[PDB]
Design an enzyme around this catalytic site. Structure first.
Site, PDB file in Angstrom:
ATOM      1  CG  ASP A 230       2.961  -3.090 -15.736  1.00 47.26           C
ATOM      2  OD1 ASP A 230       2.990  -4.040 -16.552  1.00 47.26           O
ATOM      3  OD2 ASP A 230       3.263  -1.923 -16.066  1.00 47.26           O
TER       4      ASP A 230
ATOM      5  CG  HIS B 270       3.092  27.376   0.107  1.00 46.20           C
ATOM      6  ND1 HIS B 270       2.512  28.574  -0.249  1.00 46.20           N
ATOM      7  CD2 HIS B 270       4.424  27.530  -0.085  1.00 46.20           C
ATOM      8  CE1 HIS B 270       3.450  29.409  -0.658  1.00 46.20           C
ATOM      9  NE2 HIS B 270       4.619  28.800  -0.566  1.00 46.20           N
ATOM     10  CD  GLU B 271       7.062  25.341   1.554  1.00 47.82           C
ATOM     11  OE1 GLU B 271       7.782  25.257   0.538  1.00 47.82           O
ATOM     12  OE2 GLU B 271       6.764  26.437   2.057  1.00 47.82           O
TER      13      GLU B 271
HETATM   14 CA   LIG Z   1       2.739  -5.290 -18.390  1.00 52.98          CA
HETATM   15 ZN   LIG Z   2       6.737  29.317  -1.109  1.00 51.18          ZN
END
Ligand SMILES: [Ca+2]
Ligand SMILES: [Zn+2]
Ligand SMILES: *[C@@H]1O[C@H](CO)[C@@H](O[C@@H]2O[C@H](CO)[C@@H](O)[C@H](O)[C@H]2NC(C)=O)[C@H](O)[C@H]1NC(C)=O
Ligand SMILES: [Ca+2]
Ligand SMILES: [Ca+2]
Ligand SMILES: [Ca+2]
Ligand SMILES: [Ca+2]
Ligand SMILES: [Ca+2]
Ligand SMILES: [Ca+2]
Ligand SMILES: [Cl-]
Length: 417
Positions: free
Chosen positions: A290, A141-142
């Site tokens: 990357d 929920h949070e």
């Molecule tokens: Ca790259």
């Molecule tokens: Zn809430």
């Protein structure tokens, strides 16, 4: 296109928790591993993964002052996470789990639409129940709120069950997000682009004990396609997380039809001339990590300098904001950045808008020459209080010959990086 998002989460257990469980840290860790796994299952339905990359237990002392005042505590935890935790650990989101009793009826508190924000990508949760599912629902929920999801109202639906984003905790709560929550989650994805949750975490990044069938590729597993019932991976035996006979691989960007893709097959497109493309090796199922070219390297016919895989330049930022025929404004437009007003400034310092010095004017708000038929504006800028940073000159943008923007300063490119 990778359809799933991944929330790399650090969980922080306070001293009150340690005390509550009589110093039994194994019991605490297990409860947390279970809670994170329950969250993972909840989020699956929304094409999300919840991944434990950190578990901090404050046995010696709390690193903040944990208070019944949820506002003080949310903010104190947010500050510590940004300036201390983010410097020790790469992660998307942090949750504080506390043994104290918050003021009032509150058992969970979190910023709305904050996922990936250095400070605001945090939630705080009171250890309200020994039932692990109940605690996991509060945690889900949070993190829902971090994901720009608000509470369910009207006809929001998740089967007959009580939905996770209901404003109050159910006595017997479900693992199900509503249709409204899914929509708001992905609309928040679309609208604010939280880039930190795009990457699939490495097995060595995941610190919870490996679990076959959680759809997370972890240490000791050859593949993981979830439960036998949900598995749609012909390379993978779901039950055992083992590759089937003949399979070289069952996972990754450089795996196709259970085989390593050949040498030189593109697996990550180059986003600019500051970003070399990565290709499959032939001898691995995973796209190489990357690589970017060195920051500060001249780029785009000497219109820019490299900044983290991109070549940030004034013209392209005008183009992104205002469209095809909008050019860089004259130097004079940038003088409005000396104002220190709602739009005209270089940077903020504790919320205060700091005017640009003369030498820094090109590193504040962007100005563009707009020749739109009938709506000409030589000093067009973008301002919206929804996101005051939108329309500000990007970091690493060339502001003069041999100079780039850094924290709203036009600085020497040589010493900038
Ligand atoms: Ca790259
Ligand atoms: Zn809430
Ligand atoms: C999510 O699904 C529920 C049920 O599918 C939708 O509620 C229906 O739509 C209208 C409102 O437009 C209700 O009055 C109907 O009676 C509901 N049908 C039911 C309950 O079977 C709801 O519209 C959807 N929510 C969103 C925000 O998309
Ligand atoms: Ca780090
Ligand atoms: Ca209370
Ligand atoms: Ca991430
Ligand atoms: Ca697994
Ligand atoms: Ca000029
Ligand atoms: Ca602007
Ligand atoms: Cl003005």
């Amino acid at each position: 296109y990778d359809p799933f998002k991944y929330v790399e989460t650090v969980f922080v257990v306070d001293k009150a928790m340690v005390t509550k469980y009589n110093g039994d840290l194994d019991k605490i860790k297990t409860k947390m591993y279970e809670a994170a796994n329950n969250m993972n299952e909840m989020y699956r339905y929304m094409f999300f993964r919840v991944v434990m990359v950190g578990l901090i237990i404050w046995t010696e002392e709390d690193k903040i002052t944990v208070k019944p005042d949820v506002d003080y505590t949310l903010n104190a935890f947010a500050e510590w996470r940004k300036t201390y935790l983010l410097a020790e650990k790469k992660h998307d989101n942090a949750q504080l789990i506390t043994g104290i009793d918050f003021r009032g009826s509150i058992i969970g508190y979190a910023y709305i639409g904050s996922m990936c924000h250095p400070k605001r990508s945090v939630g705080i949760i009171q250890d309200y129940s020994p039932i692990n599912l109940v605690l996991a629902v509060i945690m889900a929920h949070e993190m829902g709120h971090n994901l720009g999801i608000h509470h369910d109202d009207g006809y929001c639906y998740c089967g007959g069950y009580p939905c996770i984003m209901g404003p109050s905790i159910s006595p017997e709560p479900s693992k199900f997000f509503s249709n409204c929550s899914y929509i708001q989650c992905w609309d928040f994805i679309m609208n604010h682009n939280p880039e930190c949750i795009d990457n699939e975490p490495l097995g060595t990044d995941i610190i919870s004990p490996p679990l076959c069938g959680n759809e997370l590729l972890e240490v000791g597993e050859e593949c993981d396609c979830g439960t036998p019932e949900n598995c749609q991976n012909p390379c993978c035996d779901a039950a055992t997380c083992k590759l089937k006979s003949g399979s070289q691989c069952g996972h990754g960007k450089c795996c196709e039809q259970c085989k390593f893709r050949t040498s030189g097959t593109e697996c990550r497109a180059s986003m600019s001339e500051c970003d070399p493309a990565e290709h499959c090796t032939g001898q691995s199922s995973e796209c190489p990590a990357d690589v970017f070219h060195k920051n500060g390297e001249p780029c785009l016919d000497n219109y820019g300098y490299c900044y983290n895989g991109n070549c940030p330049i004034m013209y392209h930022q005008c183009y992104a904001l205002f469209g095809a025929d909008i050019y860089e404004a004259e130097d004079s437009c940038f003088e409005s950045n000396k104002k220190g007003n709602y739009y005209g400034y270089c940077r903020k310092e504790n919320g205060k808008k700091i005017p640009c010095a003369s030498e820094d004017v090109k590193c504040g708000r962007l100005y563009c020459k707009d020749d739109s038929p009938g709506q000409n504006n030589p000093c067009k800028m973008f301002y919206s209080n929804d996101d005051e940073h939108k329309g500000m000159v990007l970091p690493g943008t060339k502001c003069a010959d041999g100079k780039v923007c850094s924290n709203g300063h036009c600085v020497d490119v040589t010493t900038a990086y």
